[PDB]
Assembly symmetry: none
Homo-oligomer: 58 residues x 4
């Protein structure tokens, strides 16, 4: 799988999996923005993650 | 009692929503989209063409 | 286990998609299309007329 | 072009051509058609080394 040079580059699997879950949950409970264009869909959401992760990415 | 936003999720059924949430989760895990440090926190953004059944509805 | 977008790729067979992926990798290496910055990250976009066979499937 | 590839070296540009190629196959991005022909677009964050350069 692709290894992007964004904030996931500094997180371990557990931490990345915690964040993947955050995003999936937010999508289900109505948070963020799902929009469509010519291309397809874009989902965007912002949040403050748990402190353990927040210290690492903030 | 979850918020029900008026974005594209407004046009989609529960199954369609659950499928897309799965796309978003997996995309996060497989390194797609962009995870940046925003003002106070994180922003995750990802773009994709959904599977055919959903594509029919959104296109 | 890959994502199966409902875009034109939905309508193409494995070999036609293989060929197009090659067309795209080639175009990138020879200066075609446009590689630009943000969205957070990179966007690459390229337009082209594919072979007559693929052409008929996609129009 | 005088886009980002202008400033990227051969290893970097090859890496990205491989990203683009793999993303096409794994279903990421958007393949659409016009009266023209086909358009493929995909966005992504490259490996740190390249992301550090283009951001
Ligand atoms: Cl948000
Ligand atoms: Na896609
Ligand atoms: Na086109």
């Amino acid at each position: 799988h692709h290894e992007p040079g964004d904030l996931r580059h500094d997180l371990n699997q557990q931490e990345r999996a915690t964040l993947s879950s955050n995003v999936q949950r937010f999508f289900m409970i109505g948070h963020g923005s799902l929009t469509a264009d010519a291309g397809g869909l874009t989902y965007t959401v912002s949040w403050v993650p748990t402190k353990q992760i927040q210290r690492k990415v903030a």
